[PDB]
Amino acid sequence: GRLIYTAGGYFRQSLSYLEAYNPSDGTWLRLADLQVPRSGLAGCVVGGLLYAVGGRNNSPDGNTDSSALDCYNPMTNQWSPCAPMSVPRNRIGVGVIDGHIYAVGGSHGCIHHNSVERYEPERDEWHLVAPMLTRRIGVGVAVLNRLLYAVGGFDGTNRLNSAECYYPERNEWRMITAMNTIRSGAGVCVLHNCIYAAGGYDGQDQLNSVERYDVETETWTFVAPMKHRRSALGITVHQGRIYVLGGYDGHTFLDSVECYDPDTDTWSEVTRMTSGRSGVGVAVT
């Protein structure tokens, strides 16, 4: 069956781990390390291949923000370097439309990006596209009906409840209804045609609440909260259920993986990562 892949993350420095969780049997498998350690990255999957995008290597030797894009083939257990983005993007959000990867926002040093670029795997090229209305790092990104969504995050000064949507054929961003909750560093994913925003940080506390956006009602509605409040969590969808992995809560790095069942509106803790960590990239194939 399909596996949940978690790549990189942070705990006393940025990590190189790639591990795969099998939700059907509860097992974790250690796979080939990232070639360069990274935290604050994002994962996504195009054509059965796993991509690690952006992040930074924050080590005791000093920090380097990453413009890198790397590709893992699960059939071969080999990582291959791809063309880098035009700029480093730490705490990036990514979404995939028509087999192309959009890189959204993130930071390079003190710069909080509003910019956005699009990678075509068949050509190995990145192209810049229109920038967001707002600079957003720690931004949640999801794709619904071939429109790209940038949700919450941090603009350099304020944590945001705002969200905006990009229409590729118009190459245009517009603001949509804002979330009920200010969230920076939430996990954002699409499940059953609704955009979910789980957790995050509001400038004072980590959040365990979770709300979802419906394009049809233009409304954000709360669902059951997670058991553990968290920000800088990885989030993904595996056979119609949401998983959140790790994060930070002001006191600890979480190893907790929680699972949301939309058919019962309930969370459970289904496994723990082999060590607590924040800022992972995660995807399913």
Partner: peptide, 16 residues
């Protein structure tokens, strides 16, 4: 240039 102490990122827990 001053070998400043690291600061805590309240969101991610990283020290920079």
């Amino acid at each position: 240039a001053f070998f400043a102490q690291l600061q805590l990122d309240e969101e991610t827990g990283e020290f920079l």
